[PDB]
Design a protein around this ligand. Structure first.
Ligand SMILES: O=c1[nH][nH]c(=O)c2cc(OCc3cccc(Cl)c3)ccc12
Length: 189
């Protein structure tokens, strides 16, 4: 909470982020209000992230290798994420693996079970760049992405998902594979 910077409502960056948030808010597009949007700066994690991104850009089948995704969290977790990035050791049921869950659609992250509100009724949703790369099928046992199986050089997939077909959830298992960029503070009207 020391490397957060509030964005004014009348700026390009605030509008990009908020528009993308409302576009994917579905069910609750008209119940949810935005209180605040803050830029997250973590120069070190960003460098560690860019190095991983270079390795994936050089060798992934799927495109894109990188996606913007939402992570709802508890008020107490906000300082840690801003200081350290996403920490899978805080693992709700780990249905698709013991990793950090990101959602394609904000509708999912903004639910009270993922972003529970605090005493002021404020809900914490992070926007993150995530190196999804080549994803495999998640399942509850997974302490890492699932094995690629025989005849692949790479031992494991980059991430795990609910469903390979149209995936809506990504589970990532490396501290450097997800960079928080913005903290959206929202509430139910
Ligand atoms: O935005 C989130 N922040 N934190 C979470 O733990 C989290 C978890 C999450 O899926 C859990 C789940 C449960 C049943 C079926 C599916 Cl497919 C997925 C989705 C989003 C989030």
């Amino acid at each position: 909470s020391m490397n957060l910077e509030r964005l004014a409502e009348n700026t390009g960056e605030f509008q990009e982020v908020v528009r993308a948030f409302y576009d994917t808010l579905d069910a609750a597009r008209s119940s949810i209000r935005v209180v605040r949007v803050e830029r997250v700066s973590h120069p070190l994690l960003q460098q560690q992230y860019e190095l991983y991104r270079e390795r994936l850009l050089q060798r992934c089948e799927r495109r894109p290798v990188e996606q913007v995704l939402y992570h709802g969290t508890t008020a107490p977790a906000v300082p840690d994420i801003c200081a350290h990035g996403f920490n899978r050791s805080f693992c709700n049921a780990t249905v698709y693996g013991k990793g950090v869950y990101f959602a394609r659609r904000a509708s999912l992250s903004v639910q009270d079970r993922y972003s529970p509100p605090n005493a002021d009724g404020h809900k914490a949703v992070f926007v993150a760049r995530v190196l999804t790369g080549d994803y495999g099928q998640g399942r509850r046992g997974l302490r890492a992405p699932p094995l690629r199986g025989p005849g692949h050089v790479l031992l494991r997939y980059d991430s795990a998902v609910d469903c390979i077909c149209q995936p809506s959830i990504f589970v990532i298992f490396h501290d450097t594979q997800a960079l928080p960029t913005h903290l959206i503070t929202c509430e139910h009207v």
